[PDB]
């Protein structure tokens, strides 16, 4: 319901941004050229003029799988087999340059570049595509690895999953929901800032709460970690409301925060919730999904230099649609920053 | 919703009928608490317990009248040091903790604390249950309970919350006590939750929650996989499974489609969390940002009936605690009468 | 023996004479304690302090009347929740501990505890010193002191004992607070003891005790050696040495024959112990075995004058603590006006 | 004071009586030491042992001549490498430590060291006991005793001191060997101390010392409580209690008044310490600044009778050590012949 | 040199001539590799195995013609998803790892990987051995083998190399898998190499190598000493010794002069290294500067016969490896019939 | 091979001919050793050093006579305790180690050991080099050298071996001292090896050895990579690279073909090992089964020239050690007169 309001508003901004650039659409690579869910979503994606999809694989198999699934809009989409691309050898040359002191010889580099995930990542790194969406078939850790090795993180950034809680009027941002098992205080602050930047993109003032099982106790263990994380974040970005350690009801409810912790600098309820570990975040957002009838989209990958996202294995087809939009939006924002 | 608490009160009447008509004696250490007194008005008319307030009768009668509560003008009030059994309670506490740093003077000083006195009352049979902690933090309120009343054989103190949906309920544990429970501790927490589900004539189906789906990967995945295995060996008749994610756990369709080998069929109703961060954050987010009725926490694993309120408790919240404290007291009373 | 307490008391008179005749205000949280009131009989006659009792005026006057103590029926008595500054005290404790798990209501409940109120009186200047802990275990009695008053910069809380000999006294630390002090902590504990020795006009000679003689071997030998090195860099004018055994420390004849290189000349008067096992056992053995007088313990390292009595303290003990609390209060006032 | 050593001598002669009139053979590795020879003078009139001095007989006879000591000019003197059994002693040491880093050549080099040769003499029955180490530090001097003679089954090397008061005595352990004994090790130390107490016909009453009174708190309190439990299980006829403070341990009035549940009634006489820092500091502080005769340390837990002198040992010290080495040698031989 | 491969090849013919004349089936996942096909040319003349290539038959026949290798125009070629047992293979991989993070779809994706299919072919008996990894790094190439085929009870995957001298040969382990094996792991590794030496009718003599000679000191001495003990108790008939230095192990004359007690007599022929750093550096230095022929690595410890080539392997390497894969396949089949 | 030792002697004569003709005084603590005396015979005709033997002059002259070696019947002989400077040597050791558990008496006992006395001779300028330890294990023989002579600023004691090939040589370090050098320590080891290569006028090219090729993976790969990086920053003119396997390091063809990005061109001549297990095992295996001439170990990183013979030393081995001790002593002298 609200998610369809949100995806629409997102798609509308995609069109807004494709205007102001000649009309060009972002080139998105899909390493899983024969995935059923991916192909089904590509049907919806090309009518909404969100991207130029690029499938990876043998042109015969993908056209066969496209014909088998009975999908009409896809008979003109660009398809690439990695090792056959004109720029293949130079991509191998580049990967070898990147990882030759991290245990990758020349032959391993070729063998890797024939892997669709690595080729897709290099396409984005080298500017031959604008973004990529992978991982509907392999586990997160395996899917995000070629992205991190090829594309890498920007300075001081950290790869971190981010989910949206779609409410009636506003939204919440949850991080990190996919990557860091047990982030330190320094890592949590960085995760906090990366979520805040995304909130700023929607023109909303970010208000960040570092979650714990405690209210401002700073006790040894995760309370001190989340307290220090709030302190680190505030020193790194003094214009923002960042607070912790605090419980989740205190974070989202401005009434509880006011009555019980008037000294707190977080006023008006948080819209960014930073979790102390992957257990609490992954369990939290999946329980919100299943039990409280509430809308959840994501995860969307933050902290990487170029536009890339990783889909979960249990992803829905709308999941891939949502993921491709955020990949498209991200790709466009990076291009604007690059020119400036 | 409210249907659940209504059904609970009926079960209390059901048990008190067939037991003379007697109500359980519940002592409340915070005799001058505003919230406690306000809730007790609702409670005695519902015939849930014989309340026993602790404190100076002078202060308590002032606080009762100042708030203007008519139903309470004859309910029992006790000051610890004036009670006939005060001195023997001291000698019992000193006996319990004399090799844990408590000298005789320290025991007297402690036994004057309403929390310790209430706990000793339940331990000695001078009351049937107690409810504390509306004014102090969880840790400080549960300490006298664990030192005086203690844990039963193989038990572990663990808080349990109910997620009330429109058809059935889910139970969450441990939501209040254990920071980072071991595989062995998780298994026991699962078993304690399972019995509370069984009291409701519901088949327990237990999921050991994780961020992973049957990965057994090193870390909390392996811990929850082991917890499920330990629990299954202690109670082979129960559906106990893990490690698994929360959506996989509660949704029987996802479990069926994606993990058919799993022994957990029909969606879990007991959720065991890997650590206090995940459980506290989960159930509080379910409350605040979902339309979901969550009641609790209720303390499991203790030898006698005692429950601890949260500092942020509501008045119905205190009613809920008193109902399950009464129910627990009645169940424990029945087991003892066959032992 | 008693000589030491007399000279201490007379030095209290010196300072009150040199400051108008005013006495330091001492708060006693346990206003109805039998031992405390008995000691206060001796103290108010000796013009040591202005006592301030905490409790309900009724009960303390009952216990005074019951104990048949005539001298105390006019002494200042305060019930915490009735003092005018009670609520502003609550706000101050809340201001201190709001990010340490204390909400506003909790601060009120704490501030009604005579110990927390006594500490707050001292921190806020409504009194100059406090003496607590005749009824609760050390950790519980010292907690409000550390949370409210806190330590001065770079300081560390440490119990300190005097071994009263014929000619001189020895100072033992840390005898009550730190389970297993680090090398950095030992140096500080030593420096805190040395100042106390200097107050008595004795040149401090400090030994970091160990089971070893200048071996520096891994473990507490290396720790006590390193501690002495830290202390020396902070105070190059002091005799500080270690690691060394205790007979080496107190007996200069052993030092002479076997370790001439040691910079410790003339036998120690400050003994710093490597851990609480060794210090508590040592001073408790000196007491029972060997008729040697031990007074104390006295708390060092706190910003304002505060002392914790042992639970099983005698009346002479409470007298000693107040004298040290008065003297500490007088010294702190002289330091403050600078 | 002196009464203890007197009664000890009386027991040595009592044991030599009812055993032929023969005295135990004690070897002294430091054959040219002045202090040792001076004590052997006092010792040989008391007919405590047959001394065996190690060294070159020429130098040794010269040093005895120089010091003007008439009684020692007919005592046994041995040069290690000249002894008939020297090389077979080498073969036995090599047999013991060849998988612990000692080849045949190192065994030769080692067996020439008088301490190693003394230990091997005692182990192989060429002597009954040894007293060594008057010139080198404890750790290095006790090493050959442990490498050669070793511990009895389940025993643990542990030093023991006596605190002599005028009515009774106290026993302190372990004051020389174990830095940080586990709870099991403390229990074993406790048992070894108890056996020595029984040898003097006194009922052993054992206290596991800590900084806490029956607190069982994490750390050394739990360790010492656990140790007391293990000791009680191995010797249920003994009074063994802990964790407890030292004054609680030695003063029966405190134990009664404050800890009536405690099974330790009538004051402790075996004090087991939680770590070496506390034991060494405690007993040296008792000696240096208390009126208390302290003798020892005596090494317990080893298979055959051997004792190590401390560097600060007096000549009267060497007398006491050899007296107890004798008693240990007589008892240990009697157990073997049973 | 060449002698060694010849004796092995003839041993392959001996066992096939005594088991009907059949050859063991070997799967090669990298069916279009130049080096793999080049070695298979040499092999098919020598009648060592039935080769089974994995890949698209078209590409493999194309590559066969291109490389101008005439002998291979009839060898079995299989495309994984086209094999009849493909889907039951998927279901079998799924049954093994469904509680190890692999769902059904992931299993299908994996089973199309030639390395995973080859392992499953071996596990299910559609082949007797496999040789992989001529293009990928060791760790990634060994993983499907360990996940699918696995280890026999108490075994441990361990790389093993032969140092070919002209009279005898030496065996080095573990040269590929374990970074820092425990003492138990070393013991098991030693036993696995020992079984291979026995297969050649040579009485095995095993050295647990260290930087030390029988010191047993904390660290790697203690580890290798304990490892030898564990191995000896598991296999009392074998000459197993350690800890010892390398020359002590391989030079029996040094062992004689300096360590006669060592149970290792005649110079070792099995060298077990304490960690991968020492073994990898040792054998590669033996290879490069010492004129010394080195073959391997060959993988030990797995339930069925499988071997991993290094990515940088030569063509003779593939020949040797397949010979060893065949011998292992034959032996394991005989063990299965027992 | 034999050329290298010969060429080395020529530099001894060149440097001595460039300093008057004086030869370095080398003290040998094992004065009655047969192997040592025999080597001195070969050495003294080559005018390499002035030997200084330690021991009783009576015995050493007997042993030289009995052994029938004419060239040594006037070489300097010293009995340590008879030396005029003996007691001041004691005082200096005492000055060095008094806060490391050595009192005056322990210092005397040590200084009677020829090794400690020889080291003190070199520290005090009574000699220019020493060569010891043909009878004791490395650790015990190298200990007095480090305690007395010590390390130069920022240096680290590290053993170094030469692998003599017929065109060039390799240097292996650290093959005797450091169990598990940190990345900083490895870098320092490399720099010290690099210095010695330069003394021979060869451009040093350093490879940090590992089980990995440029993987930087956690563990010893990351350690050696960081080590290579630290060294490059401290000595930017040198080819220093890592982590890399041993064959990659020594074979320039592999480095070219497989790691063209590597800054190490033309094959390594300095190999720094990650730990003592690998370095000790590597070179002894090179020695025994690679039948490659390997000399050393030679101790680097010490302030004055000192070397330790191995227990397994040959007579020519002692010669090689003495020659380099002479060279080191000469080099150290030139630097001192800067």
Residue numbers in the entry:
A (entry chain D): 437 to 776
B (entry chain C): 439 to 777
C (entry chain B), D (entry chain A), E (entry chain E), F (entry chain F): 439 to 776
Give sentences from the paper:
Distinct from other malic enzyme subtypes, the hybrid enzymes are regulated by acetyl-CoA, a molecular indicator of the metabolic state of the cell. The larger ME isoforms (hybrid enzymes) are predicted to be a fusion of two unrelated enzymes; a catalytic N-terminal ME subunit and a C-terminal phosphotransacetylase (PTA) domain. The PTA domain is homologous to PTA enzymes (that interconvert acetyl-CoA and phosphate to CoA and acetyl phosphate), yet they appear to lack critical catalytic residues and thus acts as a sensor instead.
As a control to mitigate any local/biased effects introduced by 3′ loop mutation, we designed a different unbound variant by mutation at the opposite end of the binding site—a N718D mutant repels ligand at the acetyl group. Supportively, N718D protein purifies without bound ligand and is also insensitive to inhibition.
